[PDB]
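thread from #wetlab-drylab

HS: before we spend reagent money on co-crystallization trials with zinc ion, can we at least see a predicted complex? here's what I'd submit
DV: go for it
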Amino acid sequence: STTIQQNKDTLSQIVVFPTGNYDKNEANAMVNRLANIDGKYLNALKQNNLKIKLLSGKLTDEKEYAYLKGVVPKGFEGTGKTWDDVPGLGGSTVALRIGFSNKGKGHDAINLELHATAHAIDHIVLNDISKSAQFKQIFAKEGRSLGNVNFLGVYPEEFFAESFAYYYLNQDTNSKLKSACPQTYSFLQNLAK
Amino acid sequence: EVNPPVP
Ligand SMILES: [Zn+2]
């Protein structure tokens, strides 16, 4: 409980809410789900001045992502979709559409904000650990055990991000990950030590 | 770096 509050406090210096009208209750719910992330990662994001930008509109309507208009994201070949239609982005920045957290809301991630923030943690905090030799070996074995195998089984950075999301969303997804991907589960456990 | 969610 005290740790939950600390993580929410840290997130108050990371999360940026949009200007104008937006769903305040859902944005709060999204912050609450992010507070389940281990505090070590959240503190590292804050220290790196990583902002989690919540959006009330399309990602590409933000000045800094306008360059992605019409661009097909990695792994989205054949979907008929471009960044204009994608509700979240993670990496050197994080941007998320409010209301699109759940699987099937324009994406098939277990949770939008956790998956996108995992990309930022991978890249900014852990220096692209998902491309390390260690994780590539884990990914070679377990990367096709969580579904969407033409995406999660092909890009180790996506397998990492989604496994991270399973680990931190709730107790049920945490248990599912341990059953399906035990070496990934232990890897993430040891990462958080 | 930019990465999308699962399609
Ligand atoms: Zn992704």
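DV: DSSP finds eight helices and four strands in chain A.
HS: ok that's useful, forwarding to the group
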